[PDB]
Amino acid sequence: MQTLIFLDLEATGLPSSRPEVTELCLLAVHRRALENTSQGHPPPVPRPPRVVDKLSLCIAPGKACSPGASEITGLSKAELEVQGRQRFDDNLAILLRAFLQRQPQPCCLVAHNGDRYDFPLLQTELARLSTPSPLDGTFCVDSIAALKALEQASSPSGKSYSLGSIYTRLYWQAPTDSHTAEGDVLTLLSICQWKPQALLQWVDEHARPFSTVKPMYGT
Amino acid sequence: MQTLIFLDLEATGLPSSRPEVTELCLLAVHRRALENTSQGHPPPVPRPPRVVDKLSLCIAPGKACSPGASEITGLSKAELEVQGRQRFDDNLAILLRAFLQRQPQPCCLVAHNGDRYDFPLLQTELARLSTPSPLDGTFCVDSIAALKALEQASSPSGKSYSLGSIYTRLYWQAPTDSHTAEGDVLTLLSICQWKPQALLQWVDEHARPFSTVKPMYGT
Ligand SMILES: Nc1ncnc2c1ncn2[C@H]1C[C@H](O)[C@@H](COP(=O)(O)O)O1
Ligand SMILES: Nc1ncnc2c1ncn2[C@H]1C[C@H](O)[C@@H](COP(=O)(O)O)O1
Ligand SMILES: [Mg+2]
Ligand SMILES: [Mg+2]
Ligand SMILES: [Mg+2]
Ligand SMILES: [Mg+2]
Ligand code: NA
Ligand code: NA
Ligand code: NA
Ligand code: NA
């Protein structure tokens, strides 16, 4: 895989609520930039790679946010609308396609809890459009599966897998900007920079086509 | 003006060298998000608005970086190429157009020293393409002109205008990530959040069409 695209979404609620995306962040890193990272105990927080492409967009949903979602993300439908944000629409799809076309192929999306949340929700949003999906040629992986595989390989002898728990266990500092799409992508990147060659090997061996991801719910 | 688009570029050198862009960052903020900001002396560093759209892209140039440019930005042509970055091309123009089409109109670009560097350089890059410019319906302002107008209005009775100097004079802390496109956009945003209604009034009254900007050099 040439490019890893760290992905995170905010949305109006949990899966039971048939949620709609309110924020999306993609951070594209060439594999070389990750291989080149690198410390101590606790190690200092790694510096992000220098060469990165980033896209972060706020998106007006078609339904209200649940209280918990609004309160942890700091977003609401009414605030997004008063600030002129547009819906998840065909122009957004064109934007995503052009952004992906700038990345060396093949590309793999990497999201924390992606299999149960981000990937099926993104597929739901894309299925509502008239434009072919810009993600149909991409791959994806759930970073939690990679971390758990690393744990089993490093301690076969034998915990929160929240993003913040993992980061704090690694670096003994709390993360910043939790439950913002960009903040959570940056926290995930910092976690993956801890042992980057093992994220890469997991991705190279266990990535799957994004076209296999089923929508979270029907439209 | 509905949307302010904070803009900064990195490139291969100073204007005499006929430079090419190596990094571009746009940060779009609705005027409401800035009006809603707000402290002390020195005031604490303002929190950025919650609702923002961001695009940051690294770009392979057609010529080598000068030593000073490479050393302050941390970019080089060879590093950008080995990480698969593409040139400034028509797909990038499509990406910029789709990003701008998500913003409420009219939009005004805001860049620090934009009139003498960022705006004419961006116009040079866009002039090389076969696609009509995505910026031809936008406006622009140089943030330095706005700050100097604020100084004259606040002390008619009577210094570095470097981005870092201004930030440090305001907040008594050094900025972070200097000479990265995104870091410098974020520093500029923090400066503008000091007295946001006066950036806005300057923009509302003195913005000019980006189509008036002449290329930095001929192609
Ligand atoms: N505790 C709780 N209540 C309601 N909705 C929730 C909660 N945790 C997550 N979410 C929803 C809304 C978030 O935008 C989205 C992504 O979680 P993220 O962790 O930000 O990536 O999942
Ligand atoms: N001192 C020096 N030597 C050579 N080239 C320079 C120098 N200062 C700026 N530049 C060039 C290269 C930077 O990418 C660009 C933008 O400056 P920025 O301040 O990052 O926005 O201008
Ligand atoms: Mg998440
Ligand atoms: Mg999140
Ligand atoms: Mg600059
Ligand atoms: Mg800069
Ligand atoms: Na919910
Ligand atoms: Na259903
Ligand atoms: Na130069
Ligand atoms: Na010329």
Residue numbers in the entry:
A (entry chain A), B (entry chain A): 11 to 48, 51 to 170, 175 to 235
What is written in the article reporting this PDB entry?
To understand how substrate binding depends on the base structure, the ribonucleotides in the mTREX1–RNA product (AMP) and mTREX1–ribonucleotide (CMP and UMP) structures as well as the deoxyribonucleotides in the mTREX1–DNA product (dGMP and dCMP) and mTREX1–deoxyribonucleotide (dAMP) structures were superposed. Similarly, superimposing the deoxyribonucleotides shows consistent results. Overall, our analyses demonstrate that the binding positions, relative positions and residues interacting with TREX1 are highly similar across various deoxyribonucleotides and ribonucleotides. The aromatic ring of nucleotides is shown not to interfere with the ITF signals. The results depicted in Figure 3 and Supplementary Figure S7 indicate that the equilibrium dissociation constant (Kd) of mTREX1 with AMP, dAMP, CMP, dCMP, GMP and dGMP falls between 130 and 210 μM, with no specific difference between deoxyribonucleotides and ribonucleotides.
Three prime repair exonuclease 1 (TREX1) is a crucial enzyme in mammalian cells, consisting of an N-terminal nuclease domain and a C-terminal transmembrane domain. TREX1 acts as a 3′-to-5′ exonuclease in the cytoplasm and the nucleus, and has multiple roles in cells (1–3). TREX1 is a member of the DEDDh exonuclease family and adopts a general two-metal ion mechanism for catalysis similar to other members. Our results show that RNA and DNA/RNA hybrids are substrates of TREX1, although the activity of digestion is lower compared with that of processing ssDNA.
